[model samples]
Target chain A: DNDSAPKEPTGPVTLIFTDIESSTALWAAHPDLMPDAVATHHRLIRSLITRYECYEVKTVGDSFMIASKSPFAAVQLAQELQLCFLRLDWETNAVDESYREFEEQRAEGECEYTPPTASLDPEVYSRLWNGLRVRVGIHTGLCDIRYDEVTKGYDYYGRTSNMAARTESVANGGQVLMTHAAYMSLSGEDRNQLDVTTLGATVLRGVPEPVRMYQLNAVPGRNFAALRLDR
Target chain B: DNDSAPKEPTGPVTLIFTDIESSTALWAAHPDLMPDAVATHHRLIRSLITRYECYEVKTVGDSFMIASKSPFAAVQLAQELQLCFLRLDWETNAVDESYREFEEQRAEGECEYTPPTASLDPEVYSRLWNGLRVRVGIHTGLCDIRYDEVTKGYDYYGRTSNMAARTESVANGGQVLMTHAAYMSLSGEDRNQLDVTTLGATVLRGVPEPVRMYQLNAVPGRNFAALRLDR
Candidate 1:
């Protein structure tokens, strides 16, 4: 008999959070295209969460929250998202030249295809809008999950969520930030996939104790902005 | 206006195939543990293909065959599969020791806890099993897809299937391999994430003429057995 009754928490639940790096710049540069790009971005994230079986929390602009029953899922999801963005960038670049030619022809009233009205080049804009290399933060701990009357869905609030968000804010663009709890949950082989830099016992906002954090380098060869923490 | 038909192919069709790396070795090492792990692996793959809206062909042991309408989805699916394996490995490792202890107690007839039989310590077997890595091969071109009486579901044939299988055979045990058609379909940014080694014009069984192939390096830290094939 399958005892499927919400099995007791195997361990601390891991929370994975992601935010688009350089989102503001992207919006500023291609305001017209950003909306569609963000929509596509969210669509991809939702698809990934479902595909990976991570519990979706919510999405706010370029940021989103998810809960994984397993720590490996959290790390895996982050890597998948990074790879998705990379693929999107490639596809957009391939059609760039044709799009540009269409635009030139349209200006002369000789084009069959409609031209994109974004300020940036079609390929460049596609890279910026869909090219969202993200900063992911992962943390594991206790949390309070409850149905939100306002959103009409479940939401989580606790030290875990705060730590995860703070960790995300500190992660370098295209990097994955993980707390000790999160890192400890992964297999040695999985952990070895990263070039990690340890930042010991750093104080994050609103948390009393300083939390240990590690930054895993993003997939190699992608350009990313440096991490800056306002807190 | 959403003019694009969901059922219609937007461009050329691509075949995506995935198989667990070193599955035979892992199954041999843990004969009792193999069934559940294999079932879980299949379930995960099924879930992923559904989430990506891919058409499932058939599953032969540890291998799965799927077709995606978009090359973008094919590439994304491959990356997602890799990430999923990492997460599954993490979850298994996290509960390994405690689960084993509980199992020992159960075997002695104490039975205080049922013990998490679903999980295993990936670290102990990672060396032998290579951390549950899977090799994915993608090929894009014309292919014949139809229901097969023998398999009782869909089956694929033609050059696409042959090329995809051949590419997978040569792929590093823990990596992804793709034909030129599949690779050229990706964007520059996405392509940068991969370490691509071009193996040009390799003859595949049942397919006339040689097909260009490329292999991707594992993200890092995971050791993949090198495989060689004569063109």
Candidate 2:
């Protein structure tokens, strides 16, 4: 079951991991619609994965582990993923029904996890609710690349892969977290093209030290919770 | 390079992942001391892995991916890991230096990511800073198990593995996040012996639906930030 070798260049690969926020509940509450919603998600992600020339390491359920030899292209791919999910007609998506119901219950102060409505910016909140919120984490480093007979695709090993996973873990949905290594790989001009937030030194679970992290603001004038650090 | 076949029972396995919170900064801030700290961590974790008879799936940096056939054993192992870390003499540890410096700077209102001093409980905050905070995520489900010639250990595949990884990614250090599947696997008597927080429906990044997540309050009266969910 060997597939063709992945064409990704060796050394200093940029790894990206994307996950849909709260997909478990969405699937439970809207069993009939998740397949279509997830199908649309897969199409959008795979299309961009091809467009960016990123290697598909693998996918588990709705999560994607993508890799690229080019760091800038990796970052751009992440941005496109976020932007595309936002620009979708979510009003016709299954998630819209869940959000609408949640919002209605939230107005009655029934929801327990989120901040109160008075403390939120309506525009930012609305934008977050109306679409599939994806969390993207990216890191660039040397990876131990190998092919897997099981998945019939390439896989990455060692610290670089773990760091990318951790970077994604600390991010809120609709957010892109870039490790300092990936952040520095971009040219100054390339960085200036996007709104970047310096999140400063933060702790990631599993690593031995804190890492300097940055957030790529995909959508301007939008707000999200602070980096989900080891607080 | 084939290793012995894993003896873990073939079905209904419980998976556990443990990570050090804020380890990146700790490493950079104390390069000379990190090796010792991480070594201590490894020793502590491996010892418990033996005590609980859990399979050592693999380790990346300071994180542990452990598996067990018994759900109760997995949960107990998570608690032991937390309790062991807390009981260590961190006053002599490398992390203490970082915490001391952070507190000094924080008193001057300099640290930006955390809440103000006035909003925190002295005891809970002290508990968090005085030791290596670890986040543990556990899930019990069927896993695709195989031996890797490279790592010489069993590796798990499929949704169960991803769910366990996702469950850990959303946790704050010093916390234990258990999926509904894992929670239901435990006996009521066992659950009653520990403090449990019903976190309600929460969104996990990459999961297709919102999962009912529960927090195993490893240290009673030690308050942590709310679950680092996709917000």
Candidate 3:
């Protein structure tokens, strides 16, 4: 058991947190695809981590806690991991209009559409898992990374990881949200790709300082949000 | 007296919410230039409103709430209004890292870099009100958009406006986040220009069920998040 334990990062490391943006809705819409879709989602993410030499700390639901040795590796990993969504496509997925179909029947063209009562047959929202998108947050700082022999894995603690999750929480799907800490660590081409713009000092509970999060321009030529970054 | 009062958009209006991304920071950094930067900001937005036929609902600090009649007009207004950022140049306002002058003499060479502390002295953050990006959120729903006689201007009530504000709150500067309701109202050509994608049914407080938000790709060549939409 002792020989099987994984190692952990101790110095200032880039901690990353990622979530399958709307897996809950996707699961509620198509209960059948959850297992397969999530399985593929996990496998690919794990593969990409191995490819990038980053370690997976843990996962809560569709959220993943990963640790990278440096910002360069962390960002490189995020760019690649977000791109993994392209490989997942569920066969059982179908048109969301069944809700639309159910709409015409019940409202008979009455309601303006809220879908609160569009309670599904569960299977009605058969949209493919293909639409699954990911949001990633990265921050570079000292973390209490520890090797847990009991669990045979690595674990992380502190604002380094906590802020990473909070950072990821604000991002829209397919975004790689970064903190100033993470941003300052990047060099050359890595930083060049990021159209890293400020989201302002947002309050993160438990953390004393306001979070100055940045939206990574991972995907080219796109702008996000509706009317504000940290509105 | 009634002749000088403002008008309101009733019915199903496409509510557009916009905000200067980080004006508080702007003011703190350039107390002197805040007036010039904001005056220009306010004037350009109002002019764009007149040109687009959109009505100004109200403003909370830097938050600008406007209403547009159609998806076409709203989309047109957003595209044009957002472009107005290009006009507000930072040279008209700047700090030059000139912020370093305020750094505590002892910590100047000793500290590991923390601008949050070096936050004051007014002119410390002189990077052109130019980087003052905007976040715009659009949601179309039924709301009581009416002229409040007491305020001598217009007012907005209901989830239509509430949701629009919430949408903008989550956006990054240079983004135009939209709700499904807003997206659905867009015309073929207008919405066609937008690179629309889902953020799933995100939960918004006070709103029932889920909020299915979309990122509008008003900017060309940018594929946001993971998974290609029209890419």
Predicted model with the maximum DockQ: 1
> Per-residue lDDT of A1-231 in model 3, one digit per residue for the tens?
222212444468788898876567667776765665576567568767776778777789988888777687788778656544532322233323333444356455545433332343432222111245678888988878677657877777876778888888877666778888898888765666555677777676567877777777654433443211342
What candidate 3 gets wrong by more than 4 Å, as runs, is: A1-10, A87-130, A193-195, A221-223, A226-231, B1-231
RMSD of 1: 22.7
- lDDT (CA) per prediction: 0.63, 0.74, 0.63
TM-score of chain B of 1: 0.68
Model 2, residue B26: C-alpha shift (Å): 1.2
TM-score for the A-chain in each candidate structure: 0.71, 0.83, 0.73
Docking class of 2: incorrect
Residue range B44-73, candidate 1, lDDT tens digits: 887778777777764544677787777767
- Residues B112-221 of candidate 3 have per-residue lDDT tens digits of 54333235444433221124557788998777855643235655666687788777766755567788898888866766776676677766644568778887755543
Docking class of 3: incorrect
Better of 1 and 3 by TM-score: 1
Best by TM-score: 2
Scored by lDDT, model 1 comes in at 0.63
Q: Between the candidate structures 1 and 3, which one is better when assessed by DockQ?
A: 1
